[PDB]
Design a protein around this ligand. Sequence first.
Ligand SMILES: Nc1nc2c(ncn2[C@@H]2O[C@H](COP(=O)(O)OP(=O)(O)NP(=O)(O)O)[C@@H](O)[C@H]2O)c(=O)[nH]1
Ligand SMILES: Nc1nc2c(ncn2[C@@H]2O[C@H](COP(=O)(O)OP(=O)(O)NP(=O)(O)O)[C@@H](O)[C@H]2O)c(=O)[nH]1
Ligand SMILES: Nc1nc2c(ncn2[C@@H]2O[C@H](COP(=O)(O)OP(=O)(O)NP(=O)(O)O)[C@@H](O)[C@H]2O)c(=O)[nH]1
Ligand SMILES: Nc1nc2c(ncn2[C@@H]2O[C@H](COP(=O)(O)OP(=O)(O)NP(=O)(O)O)[C@@H](O)[C@H]2O)c(=O)[nH]1
Ligand SMILES: Nc1nc2c(ncn2[C@@H]2O[C@H](COP(=O)(O)OP(=O)(O)NP(=O)(O)O)[C@@H](O)[C@H]2O)c(=O)[nH]1
Ligand SMILES: Nc1nc2c(ncn2[C@@H]2O[C@H](COP(=O)(O)OP(=O)(O)NP(=O)(O)O)[C@@H](O)[C@H]2O)c(=O)[nH]1
Ligand SMILES: [Ca+2]
Ligand SMILES: [Ca+2]
Ligand SMILES: [Ca+2]
Ligand SMILES: [Ca+2]
Ligand SMILES: [Ca+2]
Ligand SMILES: [Ca+2]
Ligand SMILES: [Ca+2]
Ligand SMILES: [Ca+2]
Ligand SMILES: [Ca+2]
Ligand SMILES: [Mg+2]
Ligand SMILES: [Mg+2]
Ligand SMILES: [Mg+2]
Ligand SMILES: [Mg+2]
Ligand SMILES: [Mg+2]
Ligand SMILES: [Mg+2]
Ligand SMILES: [Mg+2]
Ligand SMILES: [Mg+2]
Ligand SMILES: [Mg+2]
Ligand SMILES: [Mg+2]
Ligand SMILES: [Mg+2]
Ligand SMILES: [Mg+2]
Lengths: 166, 166, 166, 166, 166, 166
Amino acid sequence: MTEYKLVVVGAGGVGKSALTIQLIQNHFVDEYDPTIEDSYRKQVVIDGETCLLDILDTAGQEEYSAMRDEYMRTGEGFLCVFAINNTKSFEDIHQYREQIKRVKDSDDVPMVLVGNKCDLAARTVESRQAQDLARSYGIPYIETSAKTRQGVEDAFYTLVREIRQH
Amino acid sequence: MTEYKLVVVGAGGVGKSALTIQLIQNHFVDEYDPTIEDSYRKQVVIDGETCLLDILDTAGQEEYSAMRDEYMRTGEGFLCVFAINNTKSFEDIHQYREQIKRVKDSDDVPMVLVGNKCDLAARTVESRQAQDLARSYGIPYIETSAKTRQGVEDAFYTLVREIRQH
Amino acid sequence: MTEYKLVVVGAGGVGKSALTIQLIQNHFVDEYDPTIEDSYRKQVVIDGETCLLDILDTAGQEEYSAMRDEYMRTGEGFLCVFAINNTKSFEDIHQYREQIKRVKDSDDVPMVLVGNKCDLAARTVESRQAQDLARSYGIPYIETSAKTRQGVEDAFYTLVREIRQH
Amino acid sequence: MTEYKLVVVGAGGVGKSALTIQLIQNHFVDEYDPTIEDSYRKQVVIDGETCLLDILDTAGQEEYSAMRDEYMRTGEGFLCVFAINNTKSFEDIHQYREQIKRVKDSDDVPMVLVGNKCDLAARTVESRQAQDLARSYGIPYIETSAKTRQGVEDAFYTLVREIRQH
Amino acid sequence: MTEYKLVVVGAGGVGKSALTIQLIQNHFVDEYDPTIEDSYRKQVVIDGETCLLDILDTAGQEEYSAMRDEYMRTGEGFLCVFAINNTKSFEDIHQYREQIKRVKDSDDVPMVLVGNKCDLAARTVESRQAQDLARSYGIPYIETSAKTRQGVEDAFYTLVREIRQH
Amino acid sequence: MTEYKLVVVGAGGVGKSALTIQLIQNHFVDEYDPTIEDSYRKQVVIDGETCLLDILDTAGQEEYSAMRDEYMRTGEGFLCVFAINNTKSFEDIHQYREQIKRVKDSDDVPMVLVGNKCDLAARTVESRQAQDLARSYGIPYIETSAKTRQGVEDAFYTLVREIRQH
Ligand SMILES: Nc1nc2c(ncn2[C@@H]2O[C@H](COP(=O)(O)OP(=O)(O)NP(=O)(O)O)[C@@H](O)[C@H]2O)c(=O)[nH]1
Ligand SMILES: Nc1nc2c(ncn2[C@@H]2O[C@H](COP(=O)(O)OP(=O)(O)NP(=O)(O)O)[C@@H](O)[C@H]2O)c(=O)[nH]1
Ligand SMILES: Nc1nc2c(ncn2[C@@H]2O[C@H](COP(=O)(O)OP(=O)(O)NP(=O)(O)O)[C@@H](O)[C@H]2O)c(=O)[nH]1
Ligand SMILES: Nc1nc2c(ncn2[C@@H]2O[C@H](COP(=O)(O)OP(=O)(O)NP(=O)(O)O)[C@@H](O)[C@H]2O)c(=O)[nH]1
Ligand SMILES: Nc1nc2c(ncn2[C@@H]2O[C@H](COP(=O)(O)OP(=O)(O)NP(=O)(O)O)[C@@H](O)[C@H]2O)c(=O)[nH]1
Ligand SMILES: Nc1nc2c(ncn2[C@@H]2O[C@H](COP(=O)(O)OP(=O)(O)NP(=O)(O)O)[C@@H](O)[C@H]2O)c(=O)[nH]1
Ligand SMILES: [Ca+2]
Ligand SMILES: [Ca+2]
Ligand SMILES: [Ca+2]
Ligand SMILES: [Ca+2]
Ligand SMILES: [Ca+2]
Ligand SMILES: [Ca+2]
Ligand SMILES: [Ca+2]
Ligand SMILES: [Ca+2]
Ligand SMILES: [Ca+2]
Ligand SMILES: [Mg+2]
Ligand SMILES: [Mg+2]
Ligand SMILES: [Mg+2]
Ligand SMILES: [Mg+2]
Ligand SMILES: [Mg+2]
Ligand SMILES: [Mg+2]
Ligand SMILES: [Mg+2]
Ligand SMILES: [Mg+2]
Ligand SMILES: [Mg+2]
Ligand SMILES: [Mg+2]
Ligand SMILES: [Mg+2]
Ligand SMILES: [Mg+2]
């Protein structure tokens, strides 16, 4: 059984925890409790391979972000999450990518760009803009909703498929 | 490092998930999303011993309870949870204990009786009544609030201390 | 290398130990020493797979049967043995199956029904009667002689082949 | 948990198997079935240490002795067994010790000399004669009966205590 | 058995390989063959603890230094080596420390400053100057000669003792 | 990942260490420092299989040869090395083969005969003479130079290919 260590990063409130909990526990967390550092483990079959996902759900609030770098350092692949109704969270992605490069000491780290909250209509980040950012990084862009489950499995399983290309 | 497998059982809505999430993630879940079967892992030091807790959070809703027995079978100790404002959940404890005895094939299984929601004032189960039930089973009774954290560490760590007496 | 944990159960004197010793050590035990709980381990190739058999030989005498359930609980597949010259041992099978279901908490446990001592002529259980019992359980019936080796490998290897269908 | 690999060697018929079976299974084998190569495993507490004994019961009959050296090579300590009513088996000990030295490539191998069948009265090897042989090898001499259990635990546990001095 | 991963870094020609080979193989390498990336493993008892040292001997020549950072990243403690007859190698230490901080993402990494070639008399780095540098980093300074063995065990074992304080 | 334990034996000065260091570290050791007992480990892909080579470089000088047999005992395959400009080292091979047979207690041990220093012209052992010796042992003969790298990978990888035929 193969183990994949995935790390979910991005600004406070973008839905990192809700995405992870939807994937692992199959329900939507409606309330907002800021995360420090939480981990989840689940055995799943992905493309015919039985494997063990260890998912680290990290803090996006600056106040709660103590030692986040020590956690990010352990990851094999990163979901870089912004919310499509939060322009600042999209602009912040650059800084999370720089932190990832820093903690892995590599310019070649498996990553997927995720635009979450796609069930909401106050979109300020258009798909094409995010596609362009992801293209500049050489990674896929996927839209998700932790509320409806749209794209959730695809985002996480795509990250595993990116780690496998590394 | 020693591993302890703990299983949290009890009627729907009594606060099994909220207790587990408060212990592992240090926040209170205010909303009610019924659980199927979720697991959590955390390394903690308990009485000077570094150990790994694997906590299984089980379904209390009959509808979601498919295969709960297959999960309970793996446990080394059980938190049997009722809510102090839910007389039926207290009366139900007998049936959870019988299920535990069934799946472990033993009359001697480490267990703690937990009266949760002790922050609420619509108490219908008095402390002495629960103490008496626990005494009949030869186990401790502890009151908790997942909301205020009262008793939460004590309940889980007491269960580890009971497993160590086995 | 795959490990299969096999458990041999059945009434006192039916030949559980003699079957196990013939398989593992290639000789026939002529004397009768009642078993408490013995274990055997052997690496064998079964259908091209190298694997490790752990065989638990259990007590059939009521007097020696203390804690048999604790041993049966660990098994992945069960040989349920009666002797073809012992009608009572055949009638007892029902009770061993019920115990297996109890300790595994499943109605779907890999099992093979074994009619031992087929080298003897005081047959009181006819093949068709045992075939019918096994059919009702959804399992194979195989006749063996620990004395001549007839059916011995087939019985144990069939049990492995049943575990593989589970 | 510490593992000790013990090997039992000596002439055909001296009681190697009966000693091993008495230790592991707590009964006396009255019949004589010559051994090829059999192994037994048991967890036991010896002087407060929980450990795993792997006991190899070897062939003493020349006819069955094919590849015995390949088995002896793996052992950490050896019980060198003769029978007190079989002078030839005592005279043969020299050759088993030479084989042990050969397969371990050492003149310093943990060993115990065992005079078995001490329940029988046709003694042709007197205690003092065996004590002298053991003294020349720098090892203990212990008398045993697989039939009455006299000395059986002492012989095997003494061998573990000799391995611990190595 | 505890494993310590040690990494030896410093300018080309300062004696990293000679130090490591003297420790592990007990001879002095007189010739100069520039290293790419070599590893050594040895079980040793240090202060009563049996442990496994994995020592990574890295390139100091810029030409051979491809991917050195990927190797340094794995280390638990670093020997930062300069030669006492090579002022430039001492001035270079700052840059190796910065690289270590970079690859470990920490300002608190176990390290020892080593002034090698102390058997030579063309000293251009005085002890006090190196002591001052080490003091500024909060680490020990030790002088060594790979040729005479002076200080060699002390340097490596001191690094283990620093890792144990971390 | 498969592990192969290789042991390099032969007379003092024939180039055992130089061969091993050329394979593992890709440089030529020009000086002569007699070996006691050194070990090297490297992960390599051989015929599409990722594996771990553990190479034991042994003493050829009689003075340094204490306990060489204890080291040789652990090996899965042996490189038996002589130098093509050292007739005595070739005549000595017989004795190393006898020692190998002794420590492995087998007449069937994976081995390759290696004629090293083939870059030198003072040849006193002709290829055909060594081919004949190897033929009598049922093993390959390969010529090497640790100085030029000729045959070095072939010798070690051939030994792995011989172990795989065992
Ligand atoms: N409509 C909608 N709301 C969402 C979605 N994902 C998250 N939310 C909501 O957004 C809020 C924040 O979600 P959360 O997952 O806690 O965010 P986070 O990124 O983990 N925050 P932090 O970094 O502070 O831990 C919650 O109220 C949650 O319900 C989504 O896809 N759609
Ligand atoms: N005031 C208060 N509310 C609590 C406490 N524990 C849980 N609750 C609330 O009770 C509801 C049910 O909690 P939850 O933990 O989901 O219950 P559960 O036992 O896991 N239910 P299920 O068996 O269906 O999974 C939630 O609204 C939660 O906030 C507590 O200690 N105090
Ligand atoms: N003729 C014949 N005798 C057999 C056969 N199998 C066992 N026996 C004999 O039946 C007796 C009991 O055998 P044994 O294997 O000890 O039975 P068991 O089922 O292990 N008994 P227990 O439950 O008390 O341990 C012995 O005398 C043995 O030789 C067989 O196939 N044929
Ligand atoms: N009276 C008595 N008989 C014994 C004792 N130990 C063994 N025997 C008997 O001696 C015979 C041979 O015993 P066994 O253990 O098979 O000998 P072995 O050394 O294992 N023989 P092999 O080398 O051929 O496998 C059996 O009949 C057994 O009952 C003992 O302590 N006392
Ligand atoms: N006198 C003396 N010479 C030394 C000492 N240590 C190393 N040398 C010599 O200095 C030269 C370089 O040594 P080496 O260990 O190869 O250096 P390095 O730091 O590993 N070099 P690189 O970074 O290129 O691999 C060799 O000629 C070696 O003998 C020492 O303590 N004293
Ligand atoms: N020209 C040449 N010299 C070689 C070759 N292999 C080794 N040498 C030289 O021969 C000497 C001895 O080499 P070394 O590898 O130390 O031999 P060894 O067999 O390991 N000796 P020991 O048994 O004492 O450890 C060194 O000077 C080395 O450079 C080779 O292929 N060609
Ligand atoms: Ca919800
Ligand atoms: Ca970094
Ligand atoms: Ca909350
Ligand atoms: Ca017999
Ligand atoms: Ca049961
Ligand atoms: Ca008997
Ligand atoms: Ca030998
Ligand atoms: Ca030298
Ligand atoms: Ca060189
Ligand atoms: Mg969060
Ligand atoms: Mg816009
Ligand atoms: Mg729940
Ligand atoms: Mg009341
Ligand atoms: Mg039996
Ligand atoms: Mg009838
Ligand atoms: Mg025997
Ligand atoms: Mg006499
Ligand atoms: Mg070097
Ligand atoms: Mg100066
Ligand atoms: Mg050498
Ligand atoms: Mg000639």
